[PDB]
Amino acid sequence: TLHDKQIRICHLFEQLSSATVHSDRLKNVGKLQPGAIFSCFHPDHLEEARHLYEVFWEAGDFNDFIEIAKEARTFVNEGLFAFAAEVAVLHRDDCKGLYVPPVQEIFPDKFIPSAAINEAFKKAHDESPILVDVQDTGNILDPEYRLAYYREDVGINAHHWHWHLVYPSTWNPKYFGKKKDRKGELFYYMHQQMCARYDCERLSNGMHRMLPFNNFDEPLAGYAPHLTHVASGKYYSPRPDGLKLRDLGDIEISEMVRMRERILDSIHLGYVISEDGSHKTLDELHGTDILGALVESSYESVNHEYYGNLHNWGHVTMARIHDPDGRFHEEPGVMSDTSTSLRDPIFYNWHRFIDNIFHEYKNTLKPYDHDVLNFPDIQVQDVTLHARVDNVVHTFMREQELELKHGINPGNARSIKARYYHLDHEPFSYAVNVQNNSASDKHATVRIFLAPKYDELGNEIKADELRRTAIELDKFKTDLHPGKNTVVRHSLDSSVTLSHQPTFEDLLHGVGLSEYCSCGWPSHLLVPKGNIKGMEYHLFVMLTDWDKDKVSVACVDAVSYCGARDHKYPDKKPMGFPFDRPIHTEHISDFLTNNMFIKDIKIKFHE
Ligand SMILES: [O-][O-]
Ligand SMILES: [Ca+2]
Ligand SMILES: [Cu+2]
Ligand SMILES: [Cu+2]
After folding, report:
1. Membrane-spanning residues where?
2. Ligand 1 center to 191 CA (angstroms)
3. HEC letters along 122-140
4. 498, 557 in Cβ contact below 8 A?
5. Is 164 assigned a ligand-binding role in the annotation?
6. Does the domain made of 1-101 have the CATH classification 3.40.50.2000?
7. Which residues make beta-bridge pairs with 293?
8. Distance CA 475, CA 477 (A)
């Protein structure tokens, strides 16, 4: 049955660091040593991961796939293996309906500090349950340690791992049959929302918006991650203050400057150059997706030779800055890995730089006129946010526990849990009042966004600047009958959030329970933290005509950031509409058509 199939998949992913401590099918794999940190960005690591998941994809049927897997995990790098098997489980038809084990439970040592992991391994020296509180103690000397609740959140780092595995940069469409609709553009939009959401935490905390890493000579600020790799005793190398990017054997920094300059040229000329010397136009309909593919870069870049691989070489050269040529035999920092790279403050400097390349392009597009915004005869008359106090959302920290036993060797304890704390918010709902003055039923997509109202120094953020910090809260279809309507929507139904990741124990049992994919934003992080007086945000609701938006769907719980399984992205509008193009008005209230509304709410943290 499917429940048996699920138990056999959980066992692929169990004590995977110990899994080490051949078949002509597995001849090109086994290059990266077990114990080494696997890079999700480096070309030669992604090549070996592709080779392994190609074997898994061509495995004649499910039992043959558990077999080759059970064997390849004996010798290949274990990070590489979790990567290749989760791409296989997501895409193989005979794995449909099967969940992959939670990644923070496969690799507990990437989500919890060396100190807690060591204490757990230590106190495992009866039968009894170990519990370690992660919570530390120390001289808080760095103001950045204030955003650690966001950067080091378990749920955000697990989402980023899972997104890059629904949308692989090595995805070859001709080999799979299958195309990933608007993969380049969703690369863009997901990493833009991670930056936009991060800048709402800086401003929540009284800090300035993050500045782009746009000059490659400037020294980086430092960050020590304090993560071990128990599979070998290696750690993610820390980065002290004041180092500058240095050439690696595989890439020179001047080659990166050169890729940036070639990309900006094409954006200012309106066309890119295909491999055959010909011109492809950066039209309004495909321009962001062509640019996503050559900036990341993916396998689908129109010209890899000429535009290179800028975003991904940025991860590799920042992760190796402590040892650019390998003479120290030191492991990369957390920027090498999609499960850890959001922890480092430098992630946001680099991805606001990359976002600025997409924004130059968006800036060559014409502002929307009233025609492309308006949904005529629809008028929005009111939004209210209902919570304990109406139009105030409350946030707070909350304790949680993570089970380490399926990922580190447990001996005889039945359970080693580490307890950590994370931001969370009270439940809320919206109520939108809409007047439908046609005399027919209409169908609307309701689009909901949140935007800070003022910067950290109390100045009003103008309309155009709001575009960079507006975060998506929801997108859903509603039918409207003639006359007055009131749409009610609950926060829990958010289409940017994962509603539930089942644990290893939920799954080996039948308690992980269609919506079986793990990509999606964490529910506890739906809104920014705000601050203890109540930080003011604009809440924007827009309705547009769904018969013009619409494009059997598994895995749509987080459609907005993750798309739909094996399906086209279900919204024809550009990702981030209405905020993706230049707004020529000083104030956001003068942008508003009748089918748009802003309500000012407050987010108020409780200490
Ligand atoms: O990749 O972020
Ligand atoms: Ca959801
Ligand atoms: Cu990135
Ligand atoms: Cu990423």
Report:
1. none
2. 7
3. HHCCCCCCEEEECCCCCCC
4. yes
5. yes
6. no
7. none
8. 7
